[PDB]
Ligand binder design. Structure first.
Ligand code: 8Q1
Ligand code: SF4
Ligand code: SF4
Ligand code: FES
Ligand code: ZN
Lengths: 385, 62, 27, 69, 165, 112, 10, 94, 65, 140, 185
């Protein structure tokens, strides 16, 4: 058999994808993904930064789901600090994590359908993506890389009209999802290009470290928001969709259902969000108000010490994982008692999913390899740090 | 008037007359939009300079 | 201050989240 | 010196013949605290620095410019 | 199965009854108002918290607010700021060199929220693409010009988030 | 296939060195074709280059260090066999190559 | 921390 | 445990050496050391503002106040001489 | 620029228009540049920049005072 | 009463007979754990839970009832546990790790630093009673 | 199911000669074992009925230059059936070959390749142990504490040579290290 190379440099498929395929005829026999083109030394750069200075690195890991990584990093720091977060901050974090989940799912579904050949749903979904990123631009000052979720509480408070605008969005996102489904779900070509492609058994998913939609499509009811709940996720009502055949079509139906349930969670968070402060009151770990630093001596001392040295995490090590839109995103943070992390491994779900591309694509058509790559929803920011 | 450096511009503002022996300088009418509060002792003959603003305060009567 | 972002009194109006059926066509 | 680990590490041969100083940094004279004491450091004596003739920034060509610190 | 069900699903197979339902959906969006904006004339909505081009502010008296505390250079996660300071002729603590690398800047706003005197701010300007790399090495004069040119909008925005910061 | 278990004595280390050297020597014909080295280098100068590397790394007496050196050399050989590295790279590494040294260094710079 | 050390204990 | 900053205590004789309990730990110090110095031998570093090891003692700032069992009020560790059998407490609520 | 209200004029001569939106918006805040030579793509002063980008509701004539 | 239509798990297939493929695996497990020394913690637990599950599989004829009383997965997730325990027994026998060293020592650190409540924590429900019965068997 | 139950069960059932350090806390129940018993422990913890750990989350290394056994290899494990996490750690220096667990967990391959690339730890019986993240021909293991942050070599285009070439590194602005440590810690 010959040795064929797909390097798509154009971001019509990821952009830094490099597959070296061994094709017998039209079937592919082994898929070896060549990674390392987006390895920017993020893990080593964390060890040279303060715990506050290393927060923006997590925005650029999974650049389609930004708040998901910040939530995990903040939870790891809180676990190593035993820092309690106010209820309003927890509700805001859950709200902006479920907005993030919808953003990631909307991008993934349509960048996967564009690979197949469906161009129309891509623009329709990016319209709602822009509508959602407007909310990102409102709380923070950045459309994508918002350093909003922070270890103590949250960076700053919500503008006045944000809740009303988010409710107005949720009044029509259901019809938007209905249109997006009606363009793809009933189509026979979409069924023929997804059904029975990429079948994975539950044992294979467990052995290869699959998580999220890749794992729940095989029948495994494993959600980290229900197995190891964090924040206020245990006070919210939402269902966990589970697949039956493990193919690419189940990964798509579940990726629809997880976004409808995300809309449901967003509505509940809007309705039940309480009043109060948005940051922990231990100003030894959180910044003082700008009116208090210019009027009180100890507040100014705290500001000065926090914005140069930052806080010091007691010597310990732990692993915290959250339910990122791709799957289980974990951070292994090691502290030696100083103001800089000693070691911080980033466990990316894409790393464990692109590794299993070899067995998912074996004995499949060449044109069926792009659907297998797109159904895993891989971004290379996290695959190679 | 770009030819005037900020030093020359802050050297042209007349000192503020204060009746008491001490004045508090915040840097702006709205406290939250200025610099940290600075208490200046007006017990000399030369005008007393704010170390943030550069504004000068002088005692009015005594 | 004491005027903080949140839901209006009585909560927000209910919003559909399930699939709406479409029976279009004579068949 | 049995620098076998240096040979199986990946450090270039030019940087494996450096002369270093092993010392314990002392307490600063401007503070009375004694927290940053008891740790030992390796000083690579990295002094070859110059000035960028575009912005005045400090340029260097020594990889071991800040590792030991 | 049932004859009626078999016939009904066989008609849909041969009459493409699930592609007409998508063609109708596309045609409905064809006759529909567009959502595109004329970028040169009309701009997209923004927020007062927008983190754009940096600007160094000055007091209304004409004195620059920067006090060379170097509190923004130590919080900068990208090491994009370099500050050199000394005692000015009046004896005040001011900067001689204040330059920001906008090719290293990640536009995170940490410098803006760390300044104790509101000297460095990220203004609303986001249209400053240059034709040369050295034009992106902003210095003190360039930053002060930015602060003077965007002073009113920056002041209004700082008034807006005074209730939140 | 799999990474071999760590050696227990110097004789096994020597055997692995010889096996790796033989494999590298058999890899010489492939490199001359994958890269246009036909009218560049004799088929023995490269062989001498690998021999020289083995010989100037021949003062090691720790079997673990020898095994690690062999593993790194095998990784380098496998990379060179593939089209991974650029052409001039091997030609920049694998080619065999007056007053006072002190006075020339003094004329060059203060940092010896 | 309760770092007691186990032993064979016959 | 080691003294703070690797401080070397010079015992002129083994006989003139009292015993104190800085935090329940047996500490041997010569007669003449203060509570602050005894704590420095036992690895505990007391806050200080006005005390300098090369200057005369002057208990101004009152920042090195510790708890002593046979004391109704906190004592300035910089100036209080160490007594045999004295139990110092530094991390108590007082 | 049809069925629209002119909010104000600029020192460079740029005219700013506004139209009322109902539920979906579109062409409700734009500029008619007084130049045509490529218009430089950036000629809006700081008093009018905020109004155009919906940062502030002040027109810019009111932002001057 | 009827045969299980689907297991709900991809790759795992319904076994038409589950009371006869489990009563044999448990018997094999009990007849092969004998090679392990009597006073070892592995043998006691592996011979306790295997006896209870074997008795349960002998009492009730229908798979639904077996699923109810054991209450730990489907009968198709118990066969894959029995077949793995059988493999583990053989691997233990060939490795023979049963020899307690004379110089053995273990540092049992016991940390108690609390963690916050919003922090993700794995909180399962109460295990079936056998998971504790085997535990008291091991301690005793 | 829980840290209180898993600790007590593994105390009794596990062979004593394998594990030499057992921390039980809320940050995570850890097991520290010798490198010659790692595969045995992980195979036991993958097949036992009450400790069905079927998911290997990741394999990471930690660099401690002050220790004799410099590198610490951490195996974060997950049990889906009992909803519990277990962490297993070993220690290895720069010239020891620890056993590979790709036989038990197929996902261990890329993590072991990344550990070898980043720290230089070699794994016995690994189907293919080559660098996975660093550039082709990369020399040195970057995630070591003695490796400089910016590395040793730099990449630029050489017009006369008509190819991208590698040159010794030379920064226009060096990395400024700020020492914020406090003496009153
Ligand atoms: C294009 C090809 C790509 C790959 C080329 C190779 C690149 C790596 C080159 C190898 C790197 C190494 O150091 S790997 C080999 C290093 N290992 C040793 O040198 C073992 C110590 N030497 C001895 O024991 C003896 O001197 C001995 C020399 C054996 C003979 O002498 P005797 O038997 O009398 O005793
Ligand atoms: S915005 Fe962030 S990266 Fe840019 S100069 Fe300020 S602190 Fe540095
Ligand atoms: S801009 Fe602000 S933070 Fe930066 S040096 Fe000047 S006063 Fe300090
Ligand atoms: S140090 Fe000031 S009272 Fe003792
Ligand atoms: Zn002032």
């Amino acid at each position: 058999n010959f040795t064929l190379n797909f390097g798509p440099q154009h971001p019509a498929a990821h952009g830094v994808l490099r597959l070296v395929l061994e094709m017998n005829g039209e079937v592919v026999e082994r898929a070896e993904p060549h990674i390392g083109l987006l390895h920017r030394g993020t893990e080593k750069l964390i060890e040279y930064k303060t715990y506050l200075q290393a927060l923006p690195y997590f925005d650029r890991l999974d650049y389609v789901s930004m708040m998901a990584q910040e939530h995990a990093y903040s939870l790891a720091v809180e676990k190593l600090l035993n820092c309690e977060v106010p209820l309003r901050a927890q509700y805001i974090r859950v709200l902006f994590c479920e907005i993030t989940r919808i953003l990631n799912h909307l991008l993934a579904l349509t960048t996967h359908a564009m690979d197949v050949g469906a161009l129309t749903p891509f623009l329709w979904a990016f319209e709602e993506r822009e509508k959602l990123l407007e909310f990102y631009e409102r709380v923070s000052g950045a459309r994508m890389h918002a350093s909003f979720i922070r270890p103590g509480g949250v960076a700053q408070d919500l503008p006045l009209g944000l809740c009303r605008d988010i409710d107005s969005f949720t009044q029509q996102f259901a019809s938007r999802i209905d249109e997006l489904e009606e363009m793809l779900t009933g189509n026979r070509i979409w069924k023929q290009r997804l059904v029975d492609i990429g079948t994975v058994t539950a044992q294979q998913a467990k052995d290869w470290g699959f998580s999220g939609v890749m794992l729940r499509g095989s029948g495994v009811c494993w959600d980290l928001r229900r197995a190891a709940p964090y924040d206020v996720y245990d006070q919210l009502d939402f269902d966990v969709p589970v697949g039956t055949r493990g193919d690419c079509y189940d990964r798509y139906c579940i990726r629809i259902e997880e976004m409808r349930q995300s809309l449901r969670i967003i509505v509940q968070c809007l309705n039940q969000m309480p009043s109060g402060m948005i940051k922990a009151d231990d100003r030894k770990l959180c910044p003082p108000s700008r009116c208090r630093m210019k009027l009180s001596m100890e507040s100014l001392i705290h500001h000065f010490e926090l914005y140069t040295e930052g806080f010091s995490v007691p010597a310990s090590s732990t692993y915290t994982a959250v339910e990122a839109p791709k799957g289980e995103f974990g951070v292994f943070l090691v502290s030696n008692g100083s103001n800089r992390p000693y070691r911080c491994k980033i466990r990316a779900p894409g790393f464990a999913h692109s590794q299993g591309l070899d067995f998912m694509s074996k004995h499949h058509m060449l044109a069926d390899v792009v659907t297998i790559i797109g159904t895993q929803d891989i971004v290379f920011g996290e695959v190679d740090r | 008037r770009s030819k005037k450096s900020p030093m020359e511009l802050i050297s042209e503002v007349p000192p503020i007359k204060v009746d008491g022996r001490i004045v508090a300088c915040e840097g702006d009418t709205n406290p939250a939009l200025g610099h940290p509060i600075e208490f200046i002792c007006l017990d000399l003959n030369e005008p007393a300079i704010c170390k943030y603003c550069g504004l000068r305060y002088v005692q009015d009567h005594h | 201050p004491l005027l903080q972002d949140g839901p209006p009194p009585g909560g927000f109006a209910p919003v559909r989240y399930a699939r709406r059926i479409s029976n279009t066509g004579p068949s | 010196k049995r620098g076998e680990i240096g040979k199986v590490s990946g450090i270039p041969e030019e940087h494996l013949s450096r002369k270093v100083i092993i010392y314990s940094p002392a307490r600063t004279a401007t503070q009375s605290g004694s927290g940053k004491l008891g740790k030992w450091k390796i000083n690579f004596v990295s002094t070859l620095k110059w000035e960028n003739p575009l912005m005045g920034w400090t340029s260097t060509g020594d990889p071991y410019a800040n590792v030991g610190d | 199965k049932d004859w009626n069900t078999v016939f009904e699903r066989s008609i849909n197979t041969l009459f493409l009854t699930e592609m007409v339902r998508g063609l109708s959906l596309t045609l409905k969006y064809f006759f529909d108002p567009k959502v595109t904006i004329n970028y040169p004339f009309e701009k997209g909505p923004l927020s007062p918290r927008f983190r754009g081009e940096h600007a160094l502010r000055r007091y209304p008296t004409g004195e620059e607010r920067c006090i060379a505390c170097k509190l923004c250079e130590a919080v900068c996660p990208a090491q994009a700021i370099t500050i050199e300071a000394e005692e000015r002729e009046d004896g005040s603590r001011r900067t001689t060199r204040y330059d920001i690398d906008m090719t290293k800047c990640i536009y995170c706003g940490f410098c803006q929220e760390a300044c104790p005197v509101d000297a460095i701010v990220e203004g609303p300007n986001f249209e400053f693409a240059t034709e040369t790399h050295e034009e992106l090495l902003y210095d003190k004069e360039k930053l002060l010009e930015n602060g003077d040119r965007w002073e009113t909008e920056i002041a209004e925005n700082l008034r807006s988030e005074s209730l939140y910061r | 296939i799999g990474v071999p278990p760590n050696s227990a004595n110097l004789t096994e280390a020597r055997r692995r060195v010889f096996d790796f050297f033989r494999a590298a020597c058999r890899s010489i014909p492939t490199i001359m074709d994958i890269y246009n080295l036909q009218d560049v280098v004799a088929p023995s100068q490269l062989r001498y280059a690998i021999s020289a590397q083995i010989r100037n790394n021949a003062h090691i007496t720790d079997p673990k260090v020898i095994d690690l050196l062999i593993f790194k050399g095998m990784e380098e050989l496998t990379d060179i066999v593939d089209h991974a590295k650029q052409r001039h790279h091997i030609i920049g590494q694998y080619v065999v190559g007056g007053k006072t040294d002190f006075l020339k260094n003094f004329y060059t710079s203060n940092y010896f | 921390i309760r770092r007691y050390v186990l032993t064979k204990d016959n | 445990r080691n003294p703070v900053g690797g401080a070397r205590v010079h015992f002129s004789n083994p006989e003139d050496a009292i015993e104190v309990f800085v935090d329940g730990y047996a500490v041997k110090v010569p007669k003449g050391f203060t509570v602050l110095q005894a704590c420095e031998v036992a690895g505990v570093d007391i806050p200080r503002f006005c005390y300098h090891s090369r200057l005369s003692i002057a208990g101004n700032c009152r920042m090195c106040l510790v708890e002593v069992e046979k004391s109704p009020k906190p004592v300035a560790s910089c100036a209080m001489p160490a007594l045999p059998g004295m139990k110092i407490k530094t991390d108590t609520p007082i | 620029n049809i069925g629209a209200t002119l909010v104000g004029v600029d020192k460079f001569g740029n005219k700013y228009y506004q139209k009322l939106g109902d539920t979906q918006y579109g062409r409700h805040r734009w500029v008619e540049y007084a130049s045509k030579d490529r218009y430089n793509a950036s000629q809006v002063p700081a008093e009018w920049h905020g109004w155009l980008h919906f940062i502030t509701d002040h027109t810019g004539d009111e932002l001057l005072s | 009463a009827k045969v299980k239509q689907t297991t709900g798990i991809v790759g795992l297939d319904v076994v038409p007979n589950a009371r006869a493929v489990l009563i044999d695996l448990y018997s094999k497990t009990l007849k092969e754990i004998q090679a392990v020394p009597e006073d070892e913690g592995y043998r006691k637990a592996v011979e306790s839970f295997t006896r209870q599950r074997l008795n349960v599989c002998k009492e009730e004829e229908d798979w639904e009832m077996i699923e109810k009383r054991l209450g730990c997965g489907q009968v198709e997730e118990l066969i894959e546990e029995a077949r793995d325990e059988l493999t583990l027994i053989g691997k233990m026998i060939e490795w023979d790790p049963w020899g307690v060293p004379d110089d053995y020592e273990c540092e049992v650190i016991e940390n108690d630093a609390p963690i916050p409540k919003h922090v993700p924590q794995h909180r399962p429900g109460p295990l079936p009673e056998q998971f504790y019965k085997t535990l008291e068997g091991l301690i005793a | 199911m829980d840290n209180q139950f898993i600790f007590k069960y593994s105390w009794e059932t596990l062979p004593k000669k394998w594990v030499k350090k057992m921390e039980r806390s809320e940050h995570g129940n850890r097991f520290d074992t010798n490198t010659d018993y790692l595969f045995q422990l992980l195979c036991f913890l993958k097949l036992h009925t009450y400790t069905r750990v079927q998911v290997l989350i990741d394999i990471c290394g930690v660099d401690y230059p002050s220790r004799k056994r410099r590198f610490e290899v951490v195996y974060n494990l997950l049990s889906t059936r009992y909803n519990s996490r277990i962490r297993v750690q070993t220690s290895a220096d720069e010239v020891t070959r620890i056993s590979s667990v790709v036989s038990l967990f197929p996902s261990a391959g890329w993590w072991e390749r990344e550990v070898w690339d980043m720290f230089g730890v070699s794994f016995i019986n690994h189907p293919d142990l080559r660098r996975i993240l660093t550039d082709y021909g990369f020399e040195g293991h970057p995630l070591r504490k003695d490796f400089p942050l910016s590395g040793y070599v730099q990449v630029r285009y050489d017009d006369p040579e008509k190819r991208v070439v590698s040159e010794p590194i030379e920064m226009t602005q060096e990395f400024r290290y700020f020492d914020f440590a406090s003496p009153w810690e």
